[PDB]
Design a protein around this ligand. Structure first.
Ligand code: NA
Ligand code: NA
Ligand code: NA
Ligand code: NA
Lengths: 457, 457, 457, 457
């Protein structure tokens, strides 16, 4: 069919629900392959849903149009129009082209829901009805905040809490397994496997609190600032009304931003939220790395842990288990670190009344949230829940090390203890063998005095 | 149908061409939505094509299988199997799961081409035939290098050369337009609009040479290193043969890497290539920014340039032209900067015989190439070719500035010249008006002595 | 003099207060020129001061030694031993060499304070007295947290609050100055200069709250974890005692870390704090940029603001004022963004019981704090306090723009309003001139209907 | 004494050689503690030396002044005026304040060398003589290029070549030591220790070539572009003359930049050079990491290598050797990655005729060069030259692994080989023990058939 905009008319495939402007600009920006995320499209649709409800309640929009717009927005949110959003991330820096994409798709679909047709005859107008009371300039920042906040609360925090619960159950189960510490990669003072795991659990607790610290600023919505922040041409109740309705729809305490200029001229809440995300990435990197190192072998590595084997091995290559989950996590943590830089450059580069690096900022923040959430969940399900200690190997490393010699200090003094360690080292023997050789400690004394289970605090 | 691997059997949709391992691991890594790029899948298929040809020539693979494998690989390369590669970037760090995806799809399709069926009855074996003489460990590094090099030569360099040609044609056309320089954002010494544009052209020339400097290392292929770099179990002629065949297929001087350990244990060629890409990003950022600033207005900005209007305006809002191409470019340049960090962290994090951050490294490098290439092309087509000078505005800024006062220095000395500038500034007048007021310069003298066209070198 | 360690003896200049190990390792790490910051050295000295007091109170350290150690630590904190800390940042990753530097300097100086001598005869032992109850492994993380927290509270937050107060006083003063908005760099809807400034103020408020959100984790101290986190060989009251004493000394609510493993195996609090710092950097970049752009000229820029001239101009080059403070700030904001990446790579790279990227992490975090604090203060003092509006220029841009045409919409309808704007644009005239020409609006009507002061909400 | 500038007079300590402007602006920029590097100050002095010589040769500068300026510049270059350059990096973005610092110090010192005095009576004028024919705008870019190029050629490349030679001598010495490979951290196919080391050597060769690829653009000098690139007010022979003289002084092929606008409006050569530097950082990270991992223990790590012990150990803690050199290198590699981001943001942020992020860009590039050069040298001297293989441990890991089972494939087939590996794994025995138990291979057959020395290509 032919759709129309202020430049004229243009053919749009009958099967598609977008209009003139989307079609026109689907030719101006063949840049790469990244498109707006479903999360972001859904957040935009939620704003359109909320605006229709509020505009109905205020008496400025007819009920039939309002209801059809709400129903169309709900279909988008339910995932039923996956193919109607074809535009690139690399577009207008305000996200205008994508705002128009929502307006046109919702107008065409709402028109069908009213018994009408797609295209120039439609009863619902993209700008005058779907976009009523809004500007591209205040809609897109609003959608960024909503998309990021909901992804954090509904996807990331629960995944982190699940992994935390698992590692804490493992910590409890491993509380009595004494192992050799490693500092600088070198044999060190003992601790329990449970204590080491309790570190990971605490890192997750800290990360969860840091991420939560990003929410209050994200909850502040630009909607109602209109073109430049002043609220010119907005209905006086729209800002508060839309924010309350978004709150009702999401279950989260969204509020109208106390300073519209700040949340339009800048995307600082996304910069800060991403700072929290890269803190989680640093923790997950460490956790994932420790686990793959501790499970390395089966015979020329550390060998302290066994992990589940996800993908089929060789039969000739037992018990070679590649730590695929740790590799996926460590890779995505690198991606989060890169994404932070892209967000930072964009966030820093606002000019005057509007930051126009927005589609890129949103693309990165939402990707980072998905990566960390799915990564934590997958690592939980396919690795962490099945971690097992190799108890004999752990205990052999512990007792064949040189590190337990400090237990002898009270009983024979530092110098003789040091003398035994040096001799075991030089000769390739156990501490016990060297201690017996020097005549400094009987077999029975060694066993009574050298108790790893008493050396862990 | 039921397909089988060493863990057992698993259902695969009849409509799909992949096998047991792809299907199995399409459930282990539901991480986010990023999949391997077509560029990378094509480079992998090219290796399989080359291996089949070489293995035929060496006499180790039957002609019928070889021909069917080549034909299947060609179909993948022609874009006919877009839906047969469903795996995430966030997978095995070696890219093994994706190597298996190629082997299985090509085996199933080659089997059809031989008159056979998909699945367990197939005549072509994914590992024993499609993967003959190869390891996942040496295939994936090879494909990274090929994908990056071809994308650079076939996509990025031509786009950069096109933009360079356009800006140089503009430089020539604007060679006699004298304008006010700006340093620190402040009014400064004059230059021509052509000279300013010649800067952009030179930045593109420099960038093209820097990017070309990344090619020789990318041309070095790991193929033939097998599991750990030694070439154990490779046919002795395979490494050289495959590299020559990849050379023939691509038209580029690919060679067998002189040190297999280096191109397997590290992805340093990709790290370096991405260093070149972020240099281009810094240049494009500057170019894109200057152009949008110089075109800012229509009345409260700089106003020196007009740019084409891509997307329909308002009718009420002439001549407001949002610089959409500059916004797309500046955003993607931010993305390239982030991508560099992700590449760097991954590149730095190899252990012993294999770097296993590879799918992430490849994802970023290939994205950056696409962004810069399509970005440069779009900026060319939709902005640069239609840049026009606002000649009256440029000349008004020039002659109403305070900067031309230095022309008077030889004729009345520094102090009187400085005296005129200070008076024009204080009084809000032209230099000429102040010069006449002080009685230091006649009207006729001003016009004879103050010649911007002689102040540009 | 000759000082001694377990490798033997080594000459130390008589004029210096350090000992064998510092001297020895002042030759092993001639890497570049960066040394530990005074902030970090002071935080280390504070720990030694606190340990001495606590160890005295517990009865394990003699009063004379305790008092001399406290007095020596105080001298370091007062800045009296600036030349006694010669080691590089690029040292042991645990900061051990620097811990030893504190122990040796304090031992030698305390020995002098007791009537003794520097060197091998000293009454105070670096390890057995100054380092009593401590490990390098738990001291350095403790000092990182203290140094970062105090620098945030005592240096950065007050500087940010001072700049915020100034910009808010400016906002109030400029509340009635109506100006042209700019979105995408293009002329847009009006707002007041005060409203625009209120955006900056709100960004600072947000940043201050985000930075404060980093403090609780920084307040958690590793001290008492000893070698690997377990607290082996620590006096049972030392951890709580030292944290309380650091609290008393600083006025801040430092506490013993609930999980020692987490704050030793990782530096995640510093990663998060730096995430807050780079959020402030993104805001300051925007603020500093807007101000220099708005002050650009004097005649070929935007020209809306005048800023103080710090450094002497030319006399021939009035009124060229280079925005030096904005340049310093924008440059240091770039540095903060880089520093974040270095912190992130280090933070992510802990192994097992100890993260050994610590001197580098600390160097970056503390540099970023200093840069942002001194930058905000300097920008306040030398730029922000003296910002003045160029009222005639602002009002001329406003009224000579095309943007005020929307005021006519209610009185003559959109189409005629749009018609006037298009004609002014095409002809190079004011809106009023075009409106009179078309006979759509009288002079008196224009003035009554087009009221910028009513178009700002 | 009192010195004077266009704002008036100001006290300068009699002991210091700088003048009014340096003193004045030593109060405007108390930002943090970073000052211009000696490398950069020396490069600036070299330009002043070259300008004096050229200006003498052209007849525009008196011989006595020229000679005194040259002599003063030489003293600065010889390191004799370390305390005369007190300004911060965080200054004018053009580096003007630092250009003035050189002009004033050289003028005052040259005046002394002519029999005159420091201060207002001086015979040599900072601007009119020391800065003759130059602008701050073209001097600073010139000095950045010189400083970076010389640091690369004279400091970094030789250090990299020294480390490369050492690791290649080690590779040769270890060519017959067969060891277990590791991929994904897991036991893998064998290779020689020499082959593994040859990887590191090849990474260094590649890095050296990549760094060399940055030199031609760095050799292009802005000097002669004057204020905005046009060369207005430059002597027509100055650009070529100064570049030739800098070439003569340094031994390097410096040339006048073919496009002055490009090397003034942008610092793209520094962006690219830093891209090369971060490639070297990725390689050094890997090398340094592998070595510390391979030397980890003495008993609960990998244990394949011994490294020199730099700093004194414990006596009680043999043979615990912390890998301090690897820690210093890995930390500084993180710093280089961060520095790249700061350089990139600055490089991307030029406006119109001048990039004014220059002191920050230079600070980072020159720091990265020093870190990598001193890091490589220190790692060479204090680690690499003394690396020794633990031959018994290497051979025990090899022969007690499961990996050698593939040697049996030709002699008993895959299935029986796989059967032996599975049994050794399950039972905790050697492959030989399991092979004998199953009756599949005699003792004599095992030794004849399983030859690690034939499994390395
Ligand atoms: Na003793
Ligand atoms: Na004069
Ligand atoms: Na109308
Ligand atoms: Na068999």
């Amino acid at each position: 069919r032919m759709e129309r905009d202020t430049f004229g008319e243009i053919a749009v495939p009958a099967a598609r629900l977008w209009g003139a402007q989307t079609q026109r600009s689907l030719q101006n920006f063949k840049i790469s392959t990244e498109k707006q995320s479903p999360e972001l499209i859904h957040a935009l649709a939620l704003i359109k849903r909320a605006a229709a409800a509020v505009n109905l309640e205020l008496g400025v929009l007819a009920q039939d149009k309002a209801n059809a717009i709400v129903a169309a927005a709900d279909e988008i949110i339910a995932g039923r129009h996956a193919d109607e959003f074809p535009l690139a991330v690399w577009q207008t820096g305000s996200g205008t082209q994508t705002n128009m994409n929502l307006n046109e798709v919702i107008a065409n679909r709402a028109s069908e829901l009213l018994g009408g047709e797609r295209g120039e005859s439609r009863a619902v107008h993209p700008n005058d009805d779907v976009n009523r009371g809004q500007s591209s300039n205040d809609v897109f920042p609003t959608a960024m905040h909503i998309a990021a906040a909901r992804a954090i609360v509904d996807h990331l925090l629960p995944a982190l809490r699940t992994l935390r619960a698992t590692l804490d159950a493992k910590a409890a189960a491993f509380a009595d397994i004494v192992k050799i510490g490693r500092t600088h990669l070198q044999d060190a003072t003992p601790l329990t496997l449970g204590q080491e795991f309790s570190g990971y659990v605490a890192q997750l607790d800290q990360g969860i609190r840091h991420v939560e610290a990003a929410l209050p600023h994200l909850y502040e919505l630009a909607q109602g600032g209109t073109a430049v922040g002043t609220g010119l041409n907005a209905h006086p109740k729209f800002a508060a009304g839309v924010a309350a309705e978004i709150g009702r729809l999401t279950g989260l305490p969204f509020v109208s931003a106390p300073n519209k200029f700040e949340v339009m001229a800048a995307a600082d809440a996304l910069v800060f939220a991403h700072g929290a995300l890269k803190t989680v990435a640093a923790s997950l990197m460490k956790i994932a790395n420790d686990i793959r190192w501790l499970a390395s072998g089966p015979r020329c590595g550390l060998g302290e842990l066994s992990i589940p084997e996800n993908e089929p091995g060789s039969s000739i290559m037992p018990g070679k288990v590649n730590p695929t989950q740790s590799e996926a996590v460590t890779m995505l943590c690198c991606q989060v670190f890169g994404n932070d830089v892209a967000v930072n450059f964009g966030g820093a580069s606002g000019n005057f009344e509007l930051n126009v690096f927005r589609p890129m900022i949103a693309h990165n923040v939402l990707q980072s949230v998905r990566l960390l959430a799915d990564g934590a969940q997958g690592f939980n399900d396919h690795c962490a829940v099945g971690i097992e200690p190799n108890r004999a190997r752990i205990d052999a490393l512990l007792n064949e090390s040189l590190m337990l010699v400090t237990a002898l200090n009270p009983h024979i003094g530092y110098d003789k203890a040091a003398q035994i360690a040096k001799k075991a080292h030089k000769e390739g023997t156990t501490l016990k063998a060297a201690a017996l050789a020097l005549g400094y400690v009987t077999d029975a004394q060694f066993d009574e005095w050298v108790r790893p289970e008493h050396m862990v605090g």
